Design a protein around this nucleic acid. Structure first.
Lengths: 141, 149, 129
RNA sequence: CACAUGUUCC
RNA sequence: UGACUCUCUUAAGGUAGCCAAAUGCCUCGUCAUCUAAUUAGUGACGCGCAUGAAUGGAUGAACGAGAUUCCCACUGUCCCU
RNA sequence: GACUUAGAACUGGUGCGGACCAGGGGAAUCCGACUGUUUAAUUAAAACAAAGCAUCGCGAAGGCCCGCGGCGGGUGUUGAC
RNA sequence: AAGACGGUCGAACUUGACUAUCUAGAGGAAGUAAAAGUCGUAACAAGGUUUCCGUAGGUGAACCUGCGGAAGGAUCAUUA
RNA sequence: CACGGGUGACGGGGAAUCAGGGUUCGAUUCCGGAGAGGGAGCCUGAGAAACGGCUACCACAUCCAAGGAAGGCAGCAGGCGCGCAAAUUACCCACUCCCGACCCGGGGAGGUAGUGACGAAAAAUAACAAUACAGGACUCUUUCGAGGCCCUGUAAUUGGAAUGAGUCCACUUUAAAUCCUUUAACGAGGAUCCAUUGGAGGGCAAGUCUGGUGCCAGCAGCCGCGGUAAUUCCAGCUCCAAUAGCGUAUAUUAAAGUUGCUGCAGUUAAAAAGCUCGUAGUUGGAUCUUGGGAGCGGCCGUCCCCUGCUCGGCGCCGGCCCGAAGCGUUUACUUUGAAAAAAUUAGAGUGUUCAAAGCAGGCCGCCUGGAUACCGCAGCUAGGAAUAAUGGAAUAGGACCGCGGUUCUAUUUUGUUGGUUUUCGGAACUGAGGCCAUGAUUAAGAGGGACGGCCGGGGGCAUUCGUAUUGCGCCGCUAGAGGUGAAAUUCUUGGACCGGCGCAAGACGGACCAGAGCGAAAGCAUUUGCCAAGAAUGUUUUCAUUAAUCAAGAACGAAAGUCGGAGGUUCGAAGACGAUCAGAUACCGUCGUAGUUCCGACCAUAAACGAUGCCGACUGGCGAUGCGGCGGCGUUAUUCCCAUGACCCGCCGGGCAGCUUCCGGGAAACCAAAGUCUUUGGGUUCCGGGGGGAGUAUGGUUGCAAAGCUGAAACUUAAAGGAAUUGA
C-alpha cells in the first residue's frame, strides 16, 4: 500500500474493491455476463439432444480429424459442438439420443488440437460411454 | 521550498543564542516603546520598525529589550492596523495584478499569476479566522478590495 | 514536509551504521527520541549519546558502536495488545534470542520484555536489533 | 536513376 | 461479381453527395414493410434512357389556405335511404 | 370600502364552458427557410421577393443609364463600410 | 334477522404511459479463425524515402504528403 | 456515498481453508424474522390478520342430475414436472417432551427400521514350518568351495495350525422387532471364498519390451507423440500410485508476494494524468516534572510518599491518628472486573476393547464428574498518564482572601397565642479593596510577508533595425536561362538569365548561440521605452504553525483543425504537369488552394519524455558553469585612487549539468537516484494485472464541426514482451 494513514481504511478498502474488478478471475466470477454466456449456467453436467455428427479439422503441425457431435440442450435450447471422448466411439453414438455433456477440464478454454470445443460426452442413453468401450455394457436396441 | 514556486532556497535570519540585551544599547524598554510609538504614529507596518531600529538605533531585537514584540506592543496601545500586514500586502499585490490585467488582458502569464495571490490570500484569510483577529464573516472580495490600499 | 521526527532520526543513524560512522548527528531533538536513545543504551547497542540544547529544537550527537544491524520505525503507531505482542515480534524481530521491540506505554517507553514484566500494552514505536 | 517477391517440418 | 490489368480517345472523362425523386423509357425495376388483397406510400439496392455540386449538391429544427401515404376518433361519403 | 382566490357541507333525473363564444389529433415523404408579394375577372403556388453568400466596373475629365439639342440630367444633399 | 344508506381498508378488472430481459428484420459496416487464393511490399540491416507520435487531406491496398514534436537514430564527439 | 438499481442476499451463532494475516460459504437441525398458490379483509380467542379458520378477486384444479357444491402436501410418506442432482404411500408412542377435564386419551412432533459407496471412524482379502536355491555377518582357502553357531528372500514344491464372510441355533436387543455382542455346529492350500481405479517421454513414481497402425485411427489438463523400427495411438507381458477405493467434470481455498494491511509493481516487460492551483479527504516541527528519601539482597535490583476538602473509635491531651461516604479536565490508548444462550472451537478427566464418538463411571452403599478458555467489533465500570488529540488569563467577565451595600428566602428564636425587623442557613446582584513572581515557551537548515542590491530569449503593450525573398520601374549587354542521377514540365530577340540604381509588400530574427539563462508546462532570441510579475542571494526585519499531498472544480496548454475579419513574401497538405518504374495514384522537379502571417473566439490532443508524480531527511568524492553574497596577494581601466568595472585565488546557498568508484540497487541496460526493501512501514495522490477484441460498441457529457472525456462484453489465443550473449 501507498497511503499509510491511521484512518485511511475506507481509502484502502475502496482501492482494493476497485482494483479487484481489473482482475480476470474476479470479474468473471462477479458478472452476470459470464454466467449468461455459459451454456451450462454453472452446472457441472447437462443433458442434450444429438442432431448431427460434425467432423472437426485439426490445428498446426499435429493434423488429424477429431470426431465431434452437435449437442442441443433441453434446459436452455443452446447448441454445443461436443467432442466424442475416446477412440472409435462415434459408432456408439446414434441420432436423436440424449447425452450427458460436461466440460473437458480447461474451464472455458479450447483444449489442445481441437478448435473451439470445451465439452465432452460422458453418458449416452443413460448408459456410460466408458463401459461401452470396456464392453461392460451394451446399448439397448 | 516555496508553496507556489519550484524553488528550494535557504536564506533567512538566524538569531544568536544569547537572549540578553546588547552591552552597547543604553535605551530602556520604555524609550524603545516611545520610539516604536513614534514610528507607528507616522504610519509604518511592524516589519519596517524592526528594520530601521536595528539600522540607526542599534537594537538587536525588540523581544529581548522589551517584554513583548512589535505587533504586541501596538495591540496593547491600540495602534495596530485593522487587518494584519501579510494579508494587506497580498491584497495590495492582487489589486496591482488585476489593475494590470485590465489593460493587458493578453497577458496569460499575469493571468496565471493572479490565482496564486488569491490562493495565498484565502490561506491567510481562514487562518486569521481561527485566530479571531478578523471577523468570522470576513471575506476577501476582489471588486471592493481596491478601496483598501 | 517533516511529518514524523523519530522516523528521520532512526533512518539517519541507520544510514551511518551501514557506512559505519563512529558517531552521527540528528537535526531534531525530541523527548521521544531521547527516551528512544535511552532504551538502546542500557542494552549496549550504541555508544554514548549527547544532546546540544540550543534555543531551538536541539541537535543530538550519538556515538556509535558496531553492534547495530538495523533500527527501524513503525508508522503509524499501531496500538499493541498483550495477546498479539508475540505476533508482532514473530514477523519483525529476526529471532527470539535477541531483537528488541520498543513501544510506548502509560508507565513509560520501554522494550517488549519490560512491558511483559509490567503487564502493560500501548502503541508501537519501532524495532531495532 | 530500379533491384520487387518466393508454402509448411529438424 | 470482380479490386486489378490491357487498350482507343478527348479540354476534363461526374469527385463528395443523392435517386425509380417534381429528374428512370424499359417499369407496375428488385427486396422489406404497410393490406385479406396495393400500378399508391415509406426504407434500401444503382449498369443513373437523361442525378449531381452557387446552371448549386446534401441536410431539413420552426412555419406553410403548397403536393402525397398511413393510423385514432368522428360522422348519411356509402350500405340505403 | 371593496373585488379576487382557496376550502368545506348540502343538493338537483350525472346535469352543469347547459344558449352564444369556441384548436380534431398523431406518424411520415417531397418542396420552399421563414414574415411577405404575385397573374383586378379561371392558376396564392414549389412562382417572385427576402436577409445570407460570391463575383464585375468605377478615385469624378469616373461606372451606369437618360436626353433631338446645349458648361443638359439623375445616381449625387453621393466618394469604395 | 334479511336489507338499504354513508364512510374506511381494499382484492381485482379495463384503459394509457414508463421500464427490465429476450428477440425477427431488407440492407450496411466490423472482429476472430483456416487458404498452396489474388494484388502489391509498408516495417525489422541507413529495409533501399531513418523510425515513431499528435493533427488534417488524398489514394485499390498496405500507405503517401503537409505542419509541429521525440530518439525508442546510423550522431553522447568536429575545434578560430 | 445520500437516493436509486442489482443481489444466483432470510441474518447470526458458525463451516471449509489457511505459519501470520485473509478468501469463500452459511437453503440446512440452535436463536430470531417471513409464508402456507398470489393479494386483500375479517370472526373467535389473552395471544392470528391464523389458512391441518373463514370472506371475496385472480390463476389452477374437482363432482355434478347442469339445479348446485367443494380445494389448497414450502406438514410425514408418496405421484408428475423440473433437472447433473436427492429415500418408504413402513412400524410405534416403548425414549424426549408437549396438549387436554387428564396417573389412564392423543401426538407422520419425535423415536425405531427400509433405500441409501453423500460423507466420516474401525477394519478382511491370510500366517507359520520343512525341500531346492539366490544370498547376507563368521573360520579355513592367495581364488575355487565348505558348516550353518545367527539368518533374509524366492518357488501352484509340500505339510498341517487359526479365524472370518456366509449357512446357522439359543439368549440378548426392541413397544414388537432389526443390527452389534455372546453361544453351539459347519465354513479356506490355486485358503477360485480370485480388488478394483488411473498411468508408464517430462511435471510425476513406474519398459527405449513384443506385435498391429502409418500425421489415419487417435493420445495428450500443458509441453508435445503419430507421415513403416511410435519409450505417448490399439492390444499382450511387465511395472508404478491409492486401496474398498479410485478416476472425471464443475465451484472454492492454499500455492498467488499473479489484488500485496502484513506484503506487489509503475525509465525500457502492464503503467506518473501535459502542467499548475485548488475545498473536501489524509498526514502534520520542537516545547509544560524530574528527582529525592525510609527498607532488603550481592554501584545495581525491589515496595511506599511527594495528593486536597460529612459521619464514627485503639482513642488521647480546640488539636492529633485511623475507618467509611462524596467531589475533584475530557478522550483515544493500555490493564482489570462484571455482564457476557447453548451447540460448535481449543481443551481437563474418562479404556465406546481402539477410534470416530458419548458423558460417564470405579470400589468392597460409598467416591465422585459432567471443568476451563475467548465472545472480539459495540456498550458499562475501575488503575495509569508515555504517545496522539481539545482547552485555559494578554479588550482579563483571570484565579484566591476578607468584604461593604441590595433583593428574596430555610429560620433555630420572640413561653403559647398574632403583625414586624434582623442576628441567622441558602440563592442572586452591585462597589471599594488586598494578593499573585499578577497571565505571553520557541522563533524550525518549516512556511507566509516586508526590505536592499541585483538577475534573467520570463509575460503583455508600443517603437525601432537588419539582410534576404518576391514583384515592379529604369539602364546595360546578351543567346540561352531554370532544374536534375540524367532529362523534361517552365521563362526567353515581345530580350529570358545576369549586373547596377531604386521602389513596394509580407515573412523571419543567422553568425554572437553554449550539454548557457528564464518560465508550472506548452514555450521564450533585432534596438529602445512603458506596465505588472518572478526565483535566488543578503537580512540580529515582521506573523507564529499559518504546513504536505489532494478527488469535485478551475487556469494555462506545441503543432494541426474550425468560425469571423486583415493580409497573403516565402514555404506548402489537395490538385495539375514533367521524369522514374511493370505500375507512382510516392520518393525527384515546375506551379500551387487550404494553411503557414496579425487580431477576436473555439478546439484540449503530442515520442506534451527525464518514457522516471509532489513534500521532508540521510548516504562518497572531482573539476566546471549561472546568479547573489563574503574574503584575499596581485594585473588592468575612471585617472586622481579609495570604490566600482574586467581578470586571478578560495568559501557559502541552490540553479542546469558533467566526470568518477564495488556505497547501495536492479533481470540487465544502467541509476547520487532507479539507494537507504524478505534486516519489507516518513507523508500523500494517480495508475497496472498475459496478449487481442479495443480505446471498440452502447450509455452519459462537451464541441459549429473535427473530434474531446468516461468506458465494456461476447469471442479468440499459449504465448506476447523487456534486458543481455553468440552466430547470420
Amino acid at each position: 500500500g501507498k497511503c499509510r494513514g491511521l484512518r485511511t481504511a475506507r481509502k484502502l478498502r475502496s482501492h482494493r474493491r476497485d482494483q479487484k474488478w481489473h482482475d480476470k478471475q474476479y470479474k468473471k466470477a462477479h458478472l452476470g455476463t459470464a454466467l449468461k454466456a455459459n451454456p451450462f449456467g454453472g452446472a457441472s453436467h447437462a443433458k442434450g439432444i444429438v442432431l448431427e455428427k460434425v467432423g472437426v479439422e485439426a490445428k498446426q503441425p499435429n493434423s488429424a480429424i477429431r470426431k465431434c457431435v452437435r449437442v442441443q440442450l433441453i434446459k436452455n435450447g443452446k447448441k454445443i459442438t461436443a467432442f466424442v471422448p475416446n477412440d472409435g466411439c462415434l459408432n456408439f453414438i446414434e441420432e436423436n439420443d440424449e447425452v450427458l455433456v460436461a466440460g473437458f477440464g480447461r474451464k472455458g478454454h479450447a483444449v489442445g488440437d481441437i478448435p473451439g470445443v470445451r465439452f465432452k460426452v460422458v453418458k449416452v442413453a443413460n448408459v456410460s460411454l466408458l463401459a461401452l468401450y470396456k464392453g461392460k455394457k451394451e446399448r439397448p436396441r | 521550498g516555496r508553496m507556489h514556486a519550484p524553488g528550494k532556497g535557504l536564506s533567512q535570519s538566524a538569531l544568536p543564542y544569547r537572549r540578553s540585551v546588547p552591552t552597547w544599547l543604553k535605551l530602556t524598554s520604555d524609550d524603545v516603546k516611545e520610539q516604536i510609538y513614534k514610528l507607528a504614529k507616522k504610519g509604518l507596518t511592524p516589519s519596517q520598525i524592526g528594520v530601521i531600529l536595528r539600522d540607526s538605533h542599534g537594537v538587536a531585537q525588540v523581544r529581548f529589550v522589551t517584554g513583548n514584540k512589535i505587533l504586541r506592543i501596538l495591540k496593547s496601545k491600540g495602534l495596530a492596523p485593522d487587518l494584519p500586514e501579510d494579508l494587506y500586502h497580498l491584497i495590495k499585490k492582487a489589486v496591482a495584478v488585476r489593475k494590470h490585467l485590465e489593460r493587458n488582458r493578453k497577458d496569460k502569464d499575469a493571468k496565471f499569476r493572479l490565482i496564486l495571490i488569491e490562493s495565498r490570500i484565502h490561506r491567510l484569510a481562514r487562518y486569521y479566522k481561527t485566530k479571531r483577529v478578523l471577523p468570522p464573516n470576513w471575506k476577501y472580495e476582489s471588486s471592493t478590495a481596491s478601496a483598501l490600499v | 514536509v517533516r511529518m514524523n521526527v523519530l522516523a528521520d532520526a532512526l533512518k539517519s543513524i541507520n544510514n551511518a551504521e551501514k557506512r559505519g560512522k563512529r558517531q552521527v548527528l540528528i537535526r531534531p531533538c525530541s523527548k521521544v527520541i531521547v527516551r528512544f536513545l535511552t532504551v538502546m543504551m542500557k542494552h549496549g547497542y550504541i555508544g554514548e549519546f549527547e544532546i546540544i540544547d540550543d534555543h531551538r529544537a536541539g541537535k543530538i550527537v550519538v556515538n556509535l558502536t558496531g553492534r547495530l544491524n538495523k533500527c527501524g520505525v513503525i508508522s503509524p503507531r499501531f496500538d499493541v495488545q498483550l495477546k498479539d505482542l508475540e505476533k508482532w515480534q514473530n514477523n519483525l524481530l529476526p529471532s527470539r534470542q535477541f531483537g528488541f521491540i520498543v513501544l510506548t506505554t502509560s508507565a513509560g517507553i520501554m522494550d517488549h520484555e519490560e512491558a511483559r514484566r509490567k503487564h502493560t500494552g500501548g502503541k508501537i514505536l519501532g524495532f531495532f536489533f
